[PDB]
Amino acid sequence: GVYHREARSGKYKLTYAEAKAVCEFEGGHLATYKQLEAARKIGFHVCAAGWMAKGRVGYPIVKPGPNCGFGKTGIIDYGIRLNRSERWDAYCYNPHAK
């Protein structure tokens, strides 16, 4: 299944280029919206924005999301942001399960 990751010696210090380095190494691939959705149907709920394939970034949420974005419900990705220079979290994926 999918999982969230954050800096060990900090917090939000992971860029798209970095997220690509740690992953894809073993032939894996960064989690995307399409792949993320399949997880939401399994009760997957994570309120946090992180870089992904094609510089894509988003913070999927079943309903609650005060800290992330502002109210509203359901994923609210902007579809590839130009803030590729700003600092944010990051997501990954592994064939370990699902």
UniProtKB/Swiss-Prot annotation:
Induction (UniProt): Up-regulated in peripheral blood mononuclear cells, high endothelial venules, airway epithelium and submucosal gland in response to inflammatory cytokine TNF. Down-regulated upon differentiation of mesenchymal stem cells to osteoblasts.
Glycan attachment residues as annotated in the record: 83
Subcellular location per the Swiss-Prot or TrEMBL entry: Secreted
Organ and tissue specificity: Expressed in airway epithelium and submucosal gland (at protein level). Colocalizes with bikunin at the ciliary border. Present in bronchoalveolar lavage fluid (at protein level). Expressed in mesenchymal stem cells. Found in the synovial fluid of patients with rheumatoid arthritis.
Stretches assigned to the Link domain: 1-94
Source superkingdom: Eukaryota
Effect of residue 70 to V: Impairs binding of hyaluronan to CD44. Decreases hyaluronan-dependent lymphocyte rolling
Record function comment: Major regulator of extracellular matrix organization during tissue remodeling. Catalyzes the transfer of a heavy chain (HC) from inter-alpha-inhibitor (I-alpha-I) complex to hyaluronan. Cleaves the ester bond between the C-terminus of the HC and GalNAc residue of the chondroitin sulfate chain in I-alpha-I complex followed by transesterification of the HC to hyaluronan. In the process, potentiates the antiprotease function of I-alpha-I complex through release of free bikunin.
Domain free text: The Link domain interacts with various extracellular matrix components, including heparin, heparan sulfates, hyaluronan and I-alpha-I complex. It is required for binding to various chemokines. The CUB domain is necessary for calcium ion binding and transesterification reaction. It is required for binding to FN1.
Subunit structure, as described in the record: Interacts (via Link domain) with inter-alpha-inhibitor (I-alpha-I) component bikunin. Interacts with ITIH2/HC2; this interaction is required for transesterification of the HC to hyaluronan. Interacts (via Link and CUB domains) with ITIH1. Chondroitin sulfate may be required for the stability of the complex. Interacts (via Link domain) with various C-X-C and C-C chemokines including PF4, CXCL8, CXCL11, CXCL12, CCL2, CCL7, CCL19, CCL21, and CCL27; this interaction interferes with chemokine binding to glycosaminoglycans.
Protein name: Tumor necrosis factor-inducible gene 6 protein
Taxonomic lineage from the root: Eukaryota, Metazoa, Chordata, Craniata, Vertebrata
